[PDB]
Structure 1
């Protein structure tokens, strides 16, 4: 069942996600450090990014009193040390699509899992599972090390911080008492320059093809971390030309490549990624929100608006077909709350049943991880079998048949299954990534058999 003989490389995004519990002592001690009217002044002026500590407290306490969640970018690297010296973390865990994917695969105990990120400080390296390899240059040659032991002292440190606040708590901002209405999280995302240089670094770059010889597939993600423009005159395009070069090295070695897409708010960057990356890879993983974002920049604004507004199976099948037809990679996987879907060219070697089985492995693996919070060993996949296909399945199936009646299916194989939906899971972060990892893993297994 688990295709344990396959070897997979993942890049490029891995980071620390760190959680802080805002109890009374913690929030009051923080506020106490500042001048109260200095804080008040900063709230009304409303900082939309965090450059200095007063931006942070201001945005936070505004969020705490409203009792409504918020995410705010950290755009100054030097703040890492401030956060770390001011707060204690409940938990530090691995985040970033490549990180999560690497840890899930190493939890399945496949034959080999190599992960790469250009930024590997010790603190990040130690959050990976045992078993994940990292490529390094040693004595002028390629070697792999256990990733926990491959860290570079001084590498840039990407850390996203989730502040949990629970209802009930009161604190004071000078004389003014303040009770928190609801629970929630205040999220501070790493969005400074040093962690936005998303690439294979120059030392390892010359060995990518040698790395390629060691794997059956590579899963690439994290393009969404690129910025428009960089300090040293580099730009998104510069990094995207390097990204294309990496793709070429693996595909020349007969590696199949899967790109897991992501939300890219800047439409121009989103357009550059789609243009530069998608037509050149084999497999692509998107969610329902992403399908519309892509269509929107491809010019299909009406259909994108329909998808966003009504979330119908039919409009997603049409929109997936358009994206495949326009971009001409090999297979598209769409993940949605109630159904997963594959769209392939008519000459894809897999049968409908194998395509279904691959999707089923994906939703099963994700349901497992959503229930347990972590894949420790291959038997854990079986926990996903305990999560039934959702209550909308029969309606999904009926609507799929109606959709096939309305829409053309000449040039395309379209396969739809219902998800093993977990209502309210131990782990929310990265379920889409885990679906794609399982789907792509089994897609490789079936191709290899063919």
Structure 2
């Protein structure tokens, strides 16, 4: 330490080192103007497209599948999301379209970039697939684990790529109201603006794990970091072409958790919407009890309750969305799964639910939540976090108009629910009215609350 450190002058936990895994991908955008659309359409027989639209492909295996679903979307002006389930089509998309922009996406990747922007002591990101195109989208300051002659090093992630690695690219096709094109001998005028999304959902990128080269060194990484933020389990498949299943990968994920926890690393998992109820339940069973902190949104309280057998409550949260029921559902999830702290983020309020013996005071818990929503507000206002001073931009965003109402409903809920086994803290969010960016804000909230949580634990 330099010793120029001043208590009065310096809320961002600068001294922390954090590991993030497993999910990072490319988010690419294509602007569909008139020439782009017509040239795409022209490549195909119009009758063949029309027949395919009638067949209505629910996933993309061939170029015609994509063209039929996109044209259908454009004619109705209705946004849609269609999975790409064929890795070989990456080359087709890339030869066919020019990308307006390419950004990092995925929870681990977006959280890594935010923390490097905050200039904390060390940020190390891990993804099993790191082609050069992805590695280059990480911010300066992000590290990646490398084995250099049976010894563990951390290298700049931009230099650590493997060519040949599968490329997870999610593509957003933007269209505008009013554009016209011809399908054979029929003029189509797009009735409104929207987006058509093609998500990467082929096999190679669903093998989510620490690969066998880095695995023996996870303990040595654990010695370097104060915290680990894990996500990406939602990308797993229930069955694989080589006879593996989601369970196979979850046993490897539990091995990873054991290596970090034994080294006294606190682990946060950022939960996600999980489509497949069967996979959702496996992630909840295999992962959540064995970690420290879990970050969810409001919709996810009901989805987790449901798989744990609390069907009445899940229905009620879904039907009415009462704050009292969200606090009860958080309490039950914490009681059932018995990790250390739950954080829930919603449009108008953030919440922590902890065990009665958590070391932090309710004031510390509030400040950690405040730091999460303030960091999101900054990121929403600026687009990207570039230095620790950017946090102050977030401080200028007021707590939202519903703040009084949230606090009143919170006091009412306390009077109605059994509080004794828990600490519960609810704070209003700082909502940016006209944000420059909205993707990934929940991950930003979770990263910021978890980082400050770690720092507060160091004073107990």
1:44: Cα distance to partner? 0.5
Cα displacement string for residues 182-234 of structure 1 (whole angstroms, at most 9, x for unaligned residues): 11110000000000000000000000000000000000000000000001111
1:423 offset after TM fit, Å? 3.3
Q: Distance in 1 between matches of 2:348 and 2:319?
A: 16
TM-score using structure 1 length: 0.99
For 1:306 and 1:84, locate their aligned partners in 2 and report how far apart those are by CA, in whole Å.
Answer: 46
Task: Name the residue aligned to 2:307.
Answer: 297
Q: Secondary structure at the match of 1:134?
A: strand
Judge which range, 205-214 or 138-147, deviates more. 138-147
In structure 1, C-alpha distance between the alignment counterparts of 2:188 and 2:291, rounded to whole Å: 53
Aligned equivalent of 1:239: 249
Structure 1 residue 378 displacement after superposition: 0.6
Taking the aligned partners of 1:13 and 1:305, their CA distance within structure 2 comes to 31
Aligned partner (choices 47, 57, 80) of residue 37 of structure 1: 47
The C-alpha deviation readout for 1:90-143, integer Å capped at 9, x for no partner, is 000000000000000000000000000000000000000000000011212211
Where 1:449 maps in the other structure, the secondary structure is coil
Partner SS state of residue 292, structure 1: helix
The separation in 2 between residues aligned to 1:172 and 1:303, in whole angstroms, is 51
SS at match of 2:458: helix
Query: Structure 2 CA distance, aligned partners of 1:196 and 1:319?
Result: 30
Which consecutive residues of structure 2, in runs of 5 or more, have no partner in the other structure?
A: 1-10
SS across alignment from 2:304: helix
Residue 424 (structure 1) shift:
3.8
Query: Which position in structure 2 is the counterpart of 1:193?
Result: 203
Deviation per residue, 1:343-364 (Å, 9 max, x gap): 0000000000000000000000
How has the CA–CA distance of structure 1 residues 423 and 311 changed in structure 2, closer, same or farther, with 3 Å as cutoff?
farther
CA distance in 2, matches of 1:233, 1:137: 29
RMSD over aligned Cα atoms? 0.6
- Matched residues in 2 for 1:292 and 1:429: separation? 22
Q: Distance in 2 between matches of 1:130 and 1:310?
A: 45
Q: Distance in 1 between matches of 2:202 and 2:435?
A: 31
Selected match of 2:354 from 344, 351, 367: 344
What is the CA distance between 1:340 and its match in structure 2? 0.1
**Distance between the aligned counterparts of 2:151 and 2:74, measured in 1?**
53
Which whole-Å CA distance do the structure 1 matches of 2:433 and 2:255 have between them?
41
In 2, Cα distance between equivalents of 1:387 and 1:311 = 26
Provide the C-alpha distance between the structure 1 equivalents of 2:214 and 2:222, rounded to a whole number of angstroms. Answer: 12
Deviations 1:403-448 (A, max 9, x none): 0011010100000000001234211210000000000000000001
Q: How far did residue 145 of structure 1 move?
A: 0.7
Aligned residues: 450
Provide, for residues 238-276 of structure 1, a one-character-per-residue CA deviation record: whole Å limited to 9, x for no partner: 000000000000000000000000000110100000000
Q: What are the superposed Cα offsets for residues 303-327 of structure 1, whole Å, 9 maximum, x if unpaired?
A: 1121122211100000000000000
Of residues 291-300 and 235-244 in structure 1, the stretch that sits farther from structure 2 once superposed is: 291-300
Using the alignment, how far apart are the partners of 2:244 and 2:166 within structure 1? 18
Question: What residue number does 2:223 align with?
Answer: 213
Runs of 4+ off more than 4 Å = none
Matches of 1:48 and 1:422 in 2, distance apart? 36
Matches within 5 A, 1:80-95: 80-95=90-105
Counterpart Cα distance in 1 of 2:219 and 2:348: 39
Deviation at 1:300, TM superposition (A): 1.1
Rounded Cα–Cα distance in structure 2 between residues aligned with 1:27 and 1:162: 14
Counterpart CA distance in 1 for 2:381 and 2:103 is: 17
Q: Does 1:263 align with 2:264?
A: no
